[PDB]
Amino acid sequence: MSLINTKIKPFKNQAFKNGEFIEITEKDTEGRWSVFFFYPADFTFVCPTELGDVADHYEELQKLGVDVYAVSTDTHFTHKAWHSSSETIAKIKYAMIGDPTGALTRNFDNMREDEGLADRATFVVDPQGIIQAIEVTAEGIGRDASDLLRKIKAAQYVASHPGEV
Amino acid sequence: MSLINTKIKPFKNQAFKNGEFIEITEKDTEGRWSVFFFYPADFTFVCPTELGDVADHYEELQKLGVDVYAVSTDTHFTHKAWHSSSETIAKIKYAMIGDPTGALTRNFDNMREDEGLADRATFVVDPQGIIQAIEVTAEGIGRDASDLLRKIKAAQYVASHPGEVC
Amino acid sequence: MSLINTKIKPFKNQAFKNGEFIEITEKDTEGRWSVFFFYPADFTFVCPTELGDVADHYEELQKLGVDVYAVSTDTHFTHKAWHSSSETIAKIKYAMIGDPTGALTRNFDNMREDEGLADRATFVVDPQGIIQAIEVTAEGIGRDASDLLRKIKAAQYVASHPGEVC
Amino acid sequence: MSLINTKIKPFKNQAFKNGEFIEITEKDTEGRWSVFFFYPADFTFVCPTELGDVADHYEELQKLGVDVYAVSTDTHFTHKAWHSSSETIAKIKYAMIGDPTGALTRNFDNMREDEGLADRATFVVDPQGIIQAIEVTAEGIGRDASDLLRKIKAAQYVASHPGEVCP
Amino acid sequence: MSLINTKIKPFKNQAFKNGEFIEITEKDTEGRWSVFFFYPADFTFVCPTELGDVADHYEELQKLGVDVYAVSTDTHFTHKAWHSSSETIAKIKYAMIGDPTGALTRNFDNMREDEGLADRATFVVDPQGIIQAIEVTAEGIGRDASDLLRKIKAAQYVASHPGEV
Amino acid sequence: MSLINTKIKPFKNQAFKNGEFIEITEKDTEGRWSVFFFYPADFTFVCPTELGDVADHYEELQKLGVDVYAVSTDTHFTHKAWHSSSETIAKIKYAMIGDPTGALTRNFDNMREDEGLADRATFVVDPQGIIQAIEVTAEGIGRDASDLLRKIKAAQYVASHPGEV
Amino acid sequence: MSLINTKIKPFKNQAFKNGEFIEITEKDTEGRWSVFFFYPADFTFVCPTELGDVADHYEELQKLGVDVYAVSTDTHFTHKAWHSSSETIAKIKYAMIGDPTGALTRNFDNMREDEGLADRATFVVDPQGIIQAIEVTAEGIGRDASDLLRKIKAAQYVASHPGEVCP
Amino acid sequence: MSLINTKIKPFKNQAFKNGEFIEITEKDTEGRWSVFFFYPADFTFVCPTELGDVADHYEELQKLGVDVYAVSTDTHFTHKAWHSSSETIAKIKYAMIGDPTGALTRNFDNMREDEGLADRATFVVDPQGIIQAIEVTAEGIGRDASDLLRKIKAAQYVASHPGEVC
Amino acid sequence: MSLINTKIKPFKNQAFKNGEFIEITEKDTEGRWSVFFFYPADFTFVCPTELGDVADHYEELQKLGVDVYAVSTDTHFTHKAWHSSSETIAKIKYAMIGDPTGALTRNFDNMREDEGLADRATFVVDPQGIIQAIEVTAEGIGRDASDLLRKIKAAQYVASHPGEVC
């Protein structure tokens, strides 16, 4: 069963945003365009260029009315530490959702069951809750924020201009 | 339960390639970089720019040693007809897999159950059979062949030089 | 679990008829004599004379108040293309039902499970929805349209005047 | 889930042929073209001309190597009685299979559940056991034996000349 | 579980009563004494003297208010043919129930499952529906109508007079 | 499921045979024709002429090679007391099987579950163990030993001569 | 999981008392001291002196307000016959409960499964239904009726004088 | 499921006997006449005369070759303390089985489920392990030891000479 | 599945306290700081220093408003006997709960199933009924009443001033 064109499942998670800690539910995504940016773990040796690339477009994303949610199986406490410790993660102004239970990760069928870590996946969600775009890659393959931005612009176009030759 | 980083399931399908009918199995994808390009239906009123953009990069894809498989729920007979009817589909030099059973579409968890059509999804499969990249979009949202090309080059780099960075 | 003398199961399909796309449900068959003509696939190398025969008798079938529905597992978009391509399929004035899900095909128990195509079967359905005649043949064995007319006329005579046989 | 292009299921039924009782199994259909002619019941008020029209073409069917099997939910004892006191059934040279259990009838998905009787169905079976043609009609609609004869000749043609379309 | 002293199950079968086709249900047996006479098949080489012996006592059975039902897995069309073909079966004025489904046969647990035929059984049913007497015999062993008549006379005596010392 | 034309189930019961206590099993019935005569209880106010009628034909039954077994839910101790108390039961020379467990009664599906007594049933068993004739009657209706004798004579004829036209 | 100090389960059995058949339920034991005397079978070769010794003390038991119930897996018809043709059973003034189903026997966990007979057990039941004394013996070991009489008198003493130890 | 005339279930318990701790299993009861004397608890306000009676007849019981086992849900450590405390319990020369698990108590179906104590029950067990006599009484009703001796002597007579009663 | 930070299950037990028998329920622990001190058995040869050490701090525990409940699988009758027999157990001013059913022991998941005795475990329960501290040791390893006292003072501090540090 594909997760495309389906409504997102309810959740309640603690997150880090700009300093300090906030709580995010599925109620917060209502009437808003949402991006769920899943990544394995904090403090890994892999370059955090994927997250920093989104941070560079975040001002343009907020202009388009798009909320960004970076999610991992690490705690929100770890997100705060990684925000202060890493050079690139300091640019992150959007929410960094901690998912220690993995309930939100499992809502998007994105758990490495044997590792206990999220897969490298990105979800574009419309105001209705329906998933419009899915993008999953393996370890080492980078996700372009420019192509993500292009996809959102195309998704917002279909919503306003439904059905055309 | 995620489809990423898993070996592809065996299949047996009929396809259309450059005026000839050929049978493609999972054996044909072995030892080869493969791209499974799923799309809804033939002869629709939607612009065929998604499949045409892949055709433009196909020579560059064959240069990297990558096979391209365009798959839909239509028959391979329909693919031959669509290759002769449309101006953009005439450029398609790669294989056009016909999947009437939907078995190949079900293998990649990419079936619109109540429509009987494949979703707009792209899969990048390494020579071992493991899926490295998944890209799914809803009807209307276009897929970029240039970003697909970038991902394959990035996937081949990690396959060649693993453990480096950063 | 014999299919004969049972009411037809509800359906919702897209169809092509005279340069127009229409939606056909089980409601459209109500109060009318219907004929469901199933066939494998569009754009095949097999001679399309079976559909051509029904086209020749269609004027006579409409005269008896009988609706003809040609059903295939192909999309309704594919049917339009086939109407413009073949000389024999151009003669088709009746509706060409597209059944990508195979829901309507499985309703009449007529799906080639491992092939994903409809079998060569013809169904005669009365105004009530009850199936009166079933004719299934393998690939190659032709279906006679003039014998179908004989069967429909006989079915209409039994409906009008019950208990008038020996 | 359709019954077309599938091998026939094994059966063991008693039959009546030319004044003698014989037992027929799936082994008897092996290597032979077989036609299974199903009908509701014996001693019905409806014309037995459907079976009689097959009996007229039976000479031609035997020359083609086609065996005819008339199947009913009645006993083989009943078939003997219907053979004796009927003008049209007296012409039957082929076997009249009795199916009191309804096992053979259910093999072809041809049972009226509420009536306990077979439906008006004709099946064309090749030497391998694979079903090539199915014809099912309701009470009143007659089955054409000369059209059945045409179908068998067409089924034999594709068997000897495989995939000969169109040209 | 025993079939004796239990109410008969509902049924709807077509039958042949001297020249005419009728339909018999569990409703027809109500308020009346009933005898269900099961037998293998019509047009068998075995002697039909079982049904002929019941036919001789049938006039006395109607005087006692007892309805007789002859049941087999053959159709009611076959019962008519057997009536006007055999001299012994021609004496039958009682109803000949046809049971092609075997629903009535299975109600009395009397079906030869591998043969699709009824066993040689006789059931005596009172106005209430309760079975009072059961007699089952194997193929070849005959049943006596004179003994059956005696058993019904005794059953009607017990029904009218409760307790006998 | 019908009890007719099936092999009898194994049993081990104590019995009373004219003056002495014996034990009867399924082994004793083998190679011999057997008649199992079931009845409610000993010392009842109902007429014991059912068992007395069988006792009169018992000498002829032994000439035919038929063993008679009278079974009830009473103990074998009770059968002895009933033998030397009633003039009709005193005529019994055949075995009187006591079945306090009801195991043998349940083998023939003949137990009145709420009463704990046997129904009025008679079973005819051949040397192989196969039941050939069943006769069950409700409380009050009598069984005839003369008809029973006739049924055994017919059963032995069919066993020796297969197929009768 | 022991049966001591538990209320007796409901029952409906036929009994024999002084030439007349009566029906006894759990309602009849209400507000009355009850003794359930179980034994294997009627017409056994073993002495019926166990029942006879209870019959001798029955006059004293009735004065204390104690009802005696003799239970057997035999029918109430059998109890009448054993009452008529026995010297010791003729002295029985109390009820002789028949338990052909074994339902009452199973209520006291006193059934020999392989024999279908009750075991040699005696139960002392108070007006509330609560079991106060259980005595089960094997075939051969006699049950003392005068000791049973002592137990009932002791059971009545703790009922009227609750928790009077030692002093 | 009557407990009478059934073999005793295996057990492994610690016991106190004559200033010594010993382990008693079902093996120790084999080939010997055994008596299992169950009682609620140690150090109760209830008069310990029931155990005192068995102590007085113990010499006579050992003369008949009968072993006496007094079982309680208390520990074997508690039994030692009770042997030193009470004047009546000091007379106990037989083994006092401690059953904290209640395994041996549940074997004889003698557990007060909601109280966690053994009921007042006496069991006579033959050399084979078969239970011959069961006597259960409620709190307050005394158990007679002299009537127990009568029951054991009767049980031994039946074992020696079967079928010698009327 | 951990027992920590959960509300205690209801119980009804008989206990011995200062020469008197009293019934203790979960109602008695309400609004009160409670310590459930589990131990194997009475009258053992193991040094009773664990229970004696708690008795030394009992006056200091009552000063903090803490109730102490010593629990074992033995009867409350045995506790009275052990209070009079032992020199160290004579100091016990707190309640000694008798748990013959083992129901209270099962509530705290602290039963040696094959021994029928409680394990060496200490539980600290706040006025709300929530367990704040669990300490379990195998036979032989001693429990410190001073560290227990430290934990209760630390538990009362967090209850008073939550959210502070560091």
Add this chain to the structure above:
Amino acid sequence: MSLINTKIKPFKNQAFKNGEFIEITEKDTEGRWSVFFFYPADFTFVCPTELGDVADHYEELQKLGVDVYAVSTDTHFTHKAWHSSSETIAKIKYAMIGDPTGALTRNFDNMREDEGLADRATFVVDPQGIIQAIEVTAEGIGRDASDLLRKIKAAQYVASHPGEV
């Protein structure tokens, strides 16, 4: 069911020790005294005095032949970061096991299912694998390493001197 006096369940976890990363299985605890020190999460605002107290006794623990395993649901990457970031955690010379799957945490029945974090528990394990001491506290209640040290010394004494008055 209590976890006291039971053998530890098999596991395979990645850990941080002294720099750098190692893998620990149940095979590594064989023939050695082990301490499993569970704690909720890394980078929390709670003072890490519990872990630092054990670090002060670690030299004495290694003298007694005791291995210390600090476990949390955080990754081993996070453990390395927290080792470098925190003043007290820099003293940690023993292994810091990362348990993102929570499999090792669930082996000791120590998971806060709704939080996805380990409870505050300490386990003393002998060379055989058998758990000798369990110590669980709530948030805010400190665990004394001196009392832990005393318990281990007592546990090692019982192993060498088994059974005494």
